[PDB]
Design a protein around this ligand. Structure first.
Ligand SMILES: Cc1cc2nc3c(=O)[nH]c(=O)nc-3n(C[C@H](O)[C@H](O)[C@H](O)COP(=O)(O)O)c2cc1C
Length: 324
């Protein structure tokens, strides 16, 4: 339906991407998005070891014959993280595209390029995207203030950040954060982007391998139900509002709050159970404010189909109509 710099550069049918999703980005999710015509990703760090990632990549290929990428998120944890070995695993497996995210991606980006692996780098500010462009990325994913996950500390929504980035970048641009339907796609394209990336919208799909109660919570939540935790630590993260996030905010509000004071609460182990058990209060889990626009649970195939079909109709019906 839509042909853009994104679809041509990455060889996918639709200008829609399913980026990094810790715990969630498993074979089932990626295959579904890949089979749906979009650019999918397996979460590298969701797999406990490089070897596990190799096994997951093979498992995903059993569910889809279409190409898919891998997300390599650069966690700030000072704990043993064999990124190099993970990269090696991703490369050896023949992955053609990788989505990097986090701080100082230089080292990894360069390596992937040396082996013919295209790199999409997700960043939260124009200055970061430029630095990445100078590093040689194939595309930049501009993540706005609306996004689930880490939006950085500038607090600039996509409506402004996107055109500000388009004003300076040359490589393809992927709008990320706050998108869920065709209206968002057109808006993103009009603002200078060539595709949209979504996370929360994919949680609310049939194939997303998470407990049904989590999918139900996204559907019930309005746009005002997310919290920004760890702002006082300059490690801001937008997560689903729950007893846990509210607690960490109370701790930060008290003053003199260190990571060790909340570590147990923001535990990834504790957060991974939300998805497997369905206990939305067990721990911290990522969700964007765009949840307020979501209230259904389609199969990925129809979702992507409907988004581009909705977008096309907005152009030829609504927009062209106003010009007629
Ligand atoms: C459950 C969940 C887990 C996520 N995990 C990661 C991750 O590990 N690394 C990363 O770079 N982004 C991660 N993200 C962010 C998404 O890739 C994307 O940038 C963001 O969801 C866009 O905002 P949206 O939720 O409004 O679509 C996650 C998002 C969700 C909803």
């Amino acid at each position: 339906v839509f042909r853009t710099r994104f679809t041509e550069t990455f060889g996918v049918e639709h200008p829609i991407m399913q980026g990094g999703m810790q715990w969630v980005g498993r074979a089932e999710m990626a295959a579904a998005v890949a089979n749906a015509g979009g650019l999918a990703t397996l979460s590298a760090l969701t797999q406990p070891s490089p070897e596990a990632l190799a096994a997951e990549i093979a498992r995903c290929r059993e569910l889809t014959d279409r190409p898919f990428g891998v997300n390599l998120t650069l966690l700030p944890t000072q704990k043993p993280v064999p990124y190099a070995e993970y990269r090696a695993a991703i490369i050896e497996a023949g992955i053609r595209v990788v989505e990097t995210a986090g701080n100082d991606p230089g080292e990894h980006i360069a390596e992937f390029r040396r082996h013919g692996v295209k790199v999409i780098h997700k960043c939260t500010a124009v200055r970061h995207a430029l630095k990445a462009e100078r590093l040689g990325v194939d595309a930049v994913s501009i993540d706005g203030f609306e996004c689930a996950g880490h939006p950085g500390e500038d607090d600039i929504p996509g409506l402004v950040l996107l055109p500000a980035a388009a004003n300076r970048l040359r490589v393809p641009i992927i709008a990320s954060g706050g998108f869920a339907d065709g209206r968002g796609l057109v808006a993103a394209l009009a603002l200078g982007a060539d595709a949209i990336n979504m996370g929360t919208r994919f949680l609310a799909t049939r194939e997303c391998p998470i407990h049904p109660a989590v999918k139900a919570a996204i559907r019930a939540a309005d746009e005002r139900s997310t919290d920004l935790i760890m702002r006082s630590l300059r490690n801001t993260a937008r997560v689903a509002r729950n007893a846990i996030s509210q607690e960490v905010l109370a701790i930060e509000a008290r003053g003199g709050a260190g990571y060790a004071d909340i570590a147990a609460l923001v535990s990834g182990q504790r957060g991974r159970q939300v998805y497997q058990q369905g206990d939305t209060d067990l721990g911290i889990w990522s969700a964007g404010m765009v949840q307020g626009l979501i209230d259904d649970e389609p199969a990925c195939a129809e979702l992507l189909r409907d988004i581009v079909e909705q977008a096309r109709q907005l152009v030829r019906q609504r927009l062209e109509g106003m010009l007629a």
